[PDB]
C-alpha cells in the first residue's frame, strides 16, 4: 500500500505453499484518485 501525489496505489500477489524463501515480484492491482490524508490503519 502506497499513497503518493493524491493517488492510492495497491499492489498484490498470491501464492499457494516462517516466511518462505525464493523470489516473486508483485504486480500492480489498483490505483485510486482519492486525495485524502492517511496516517494510521487497522
Amino acid at each position: 500500500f502506497k499513497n503518493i501525489d493524491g493517488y492510492f496505489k495497491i499492489y498484490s500477489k498470491h501464492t499457494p505453499i516462517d516466511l518462505p524463501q525464493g523470489f516473486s515480484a508483485l504486480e500492480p492491482l489498483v490505483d485510486l484518485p482519492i486525495g485524502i490524508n492517511i496516517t494510521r490503519f487497522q
Binding site: 493524491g6 493517488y7 484518485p33 482519492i34 486525495g35
Partner: protein
C-alpha cells in the same frame, strides 16, 4: 401568531396554478444550472 393565520401572519408559500390558457411569457420554464470547478485536483470528470 401562535401558529395560526391572520393579520401580519402570512404563510410564506404561494401557489402557481398553471393552466394552458395563459400567455406566452407565463408558462413555467424548466431550468437547470451546471457549476464547474477550475482548480488543481485529481480531475475525476473529463470530456470525450
Amino acid at each position: 401568531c401562535n401558529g395560526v393565520a391572520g393579520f401580519n401572519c402570512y404563510f410564506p408559500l404561494r401557489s402557481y396554478s398553471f393552466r394552458p390558457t395563459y400567455g406566452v411569457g407565463h408558462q413555467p420554464y424548466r431550468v437547470v444550472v451546471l457549476s464547474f470547478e477550475l482548480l488543481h485536483a485529481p480531475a475525476t470528470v473529463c470530456g470525450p
